[PDB]
């Protein structure tokens with residue numbers, strides 16, 4: 001069997017566990033051998049994973065960057081070693097990449113901000129819990145959100161990163177609440193941070209602030225069905241994983257593939 005390596009940014013996130021479950025499932029069918037390596041949100045650990053793979057007979061590198069501007073060195077490592085690189089979910093700012101499979105995050109952010117102005121109203125006071133700073137996913141969701149901010153004339157009380165983490169989202173929202181109790185709505189750039197934020201509000205006795213997440217994870221949906229989470233922007237993690245192995249297969253077969261592969265978004269609300 002040929003070996004395909006998946007270098008995922010972290011396994012401490014349901015989304016990436018689904019992205020990896022999809023890859024595994026597709027590789028299994030196509031007959032490939034998939035090696036999964038956790039970078040644990042550490043650019044240095046990521047870089048160390050790519051060097052380790054190059055001497056292992058890794059045919060294709062499927063990589064989800066910890067930092068879109070720092071992964072440049074690890075991608076050029078694979079280039080020198082003549083191992084094709086396909087970035088999943090987050091793009092690389094440098095290095096030679098064969099194909100990029102991701103969602104339209106600039107869109108998903110705007111959809112988020114439009115739904116907020118629909119339920120909370122124009123001129124709503126909002127707090128944005130951003131994701132890992134130099135990742136393209138966070139950078140894009142912020143751009144799209146700013147489109148809703150400008151269009152719906154939102155008053156952004158605060159905007160701060162909680163690194164796509166639940167606990168960190170719980171603590172970031174806790175301190176922001178202390179200084180901004182008049183917050184009407186929260187846009188959390190992923191479901192983990194949204195669930196964290198929902199717990200902070202609970203702790204503060206504010207079961208009235210409108211929270212919108214992103215990803216549509218199993219937990220992210222549960223909360224929607226319990227009326228706890230107003231809405232989340234569902235992504236298809238399992239399909240960004242499958243599309244990675246499939247595109248990896250076609251490249252190993254000499255077939256020419258597209259430099260970009262989009263995956264649909266879908267607003268999720270209770271019903």
Ligand SMILES: O[C@@H]1[C@H](O)[C@H](O)CO[C@H]1O
Nearest residue numbers: 015089090137164190215
């Ligand atoms: O798109 C992914 C998901 O939103 C995940 O929850 C955090 O990292 C982002 O890049």
